[PDB]
Specification:
Residues 16-92 form the RRM domain. This is RNA-binding protein 12. It is found in: Nucleus. It is a single chain. The longest helix is centred in the C-terminal third of the chain and has 10 residues, at 67-76. The protein has a single domain, classed as RRM (RNA recognition motif) domain (Alpha-Beta Plaits). The strands form two sheets. A four-stranded antiparallel sheet has the order 2-3-1-6, with helices on one face. Strand 2 (47-50) and strand 3 (56-64) form a beta hairpin. It is 17% helix and 28% strand. The protein has helices at residues 29-35, 67-76, and strands at 16-21, 47-50, 56-64, 81-82, 85-86, 88-91. The radius of gyration is 14 Å and the shape is globular. 16% of the residues are buried. It contains two helices and six strands; from the N terminus they run βαββαβββ. By secondary structure, the protein is α+β, with helices and mostly antiparallel strands.
Length: 98
């Protein structure tokens, strides 16, 4: 398929990092914080990714102190209609559990 070039990527311990995709340009830091409402989201975690130019690529990353919380939030917020489009949440570590 799409031949993607890579260099070096290895997993690491720590909290549970979640990956958010399928997000419209309207999405903002405020909206994201409110989207994960109820769950304890680590400060400074919310990392928004932008293109080479600087514009929003509709992607964001978050971290969680507890794996149970991350999984629960993802499942409870999995396929949530954000703004005008649905967002996709995926767990970082796995599927292999250490």
């Amino acid at each position: 398929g799409s031949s993607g070039s890579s260099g070096a990527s290895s997993g690491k311990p720590g909290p549970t990092i979640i990956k958010v995709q399928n997000m419209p340009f309207t999405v903002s830091i405020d909206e994201i914080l409110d989207f994960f409402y109820g769950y304890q989201v680590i400060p400074g975690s919310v990392c928004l990714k932008y293109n080479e130019k600087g514009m929003p690529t509709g992607e964001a990353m978050v971290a969680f102190e507890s794996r149970d919380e991350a999984t629960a939030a993802v499942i409870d917020l999995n396929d949530r209609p954000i703004g005008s489009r649905k967002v996709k949440l995926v767990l970082g570590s796995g599927p292999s559990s250490g």
